[PDB]
Write a protein that binds this ligand. Sequence first.
Ligand SMILES: N[C@@H](CCCC[NH3+])C(=O)O
Ligand SMILES: [Ca+2]
Ligand SMILES: [Mn+2]
Length: 237
Amino acid sequence: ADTIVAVELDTYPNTDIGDPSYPHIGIDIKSVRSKKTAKWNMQNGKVGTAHIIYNSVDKRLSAVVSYPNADSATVSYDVDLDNVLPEWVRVGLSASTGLYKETNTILSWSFTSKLKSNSTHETNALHFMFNQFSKDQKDLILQGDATTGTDGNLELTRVSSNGSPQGSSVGRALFYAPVHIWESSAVVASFEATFTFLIKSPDSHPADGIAFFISNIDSSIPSGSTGRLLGLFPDAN
Ligand SMILES: N[C@@H](CCCC[NH3+])C(=O)O
Ligand SMILES: [Ca+2]
Ligand SMILES: [Mn+2]
């Protein structure tokens, strides 16, 4: 019942649900079966950076994911998000572990949304930036196992004191304020997101991934959306 648009950093290849046979980045429109993917040379224990951009003129959602000293991966999909998402949405980060696992640590997260009308000098805009997350983060909605304040970080999935990730975990953080991605007099609407992330696993096979998403405002973690479903989807349709 939730409507989900997402960019996925999928760390575990579930080839039965259309994943390529490698860690990849994907654009997901209302399904975990990415409309478009690109190989991603994920680096266990390194701080990666994800960038997501879109506008209403190009109607192209794109993402680039990089680490220091490495080539980047990029993926794009032509989609009019005004025909997918409602006029008001929330934006968030989601992550999961299954029988395979990893830390899903967010060190920073920023977002900008702009609606520009045909009115002279009439931009509407939201921008937030989190470089340091705190124990009691009132401008975030945390769902599932997501916690804030450990080392100034957002831990999307469960991690023990000692610092090792737990399997079968799922968590999300959504920005408190609803975001307006369309208005009747808009001539261009754009958003961008950036997050930095540290995926570390004691295992050779980490799972399952991190996603930036945009949903209906009332979105919650669907049942059984641990593991391959990334805390985003009720199933693999
Ligand atoms: N209180 C919930 C969600 C509502 C946010 C209110 N500041 C949380 O733990 O994130
Ligand atoms: Ca997967
Ligand atoms: Mn995938």
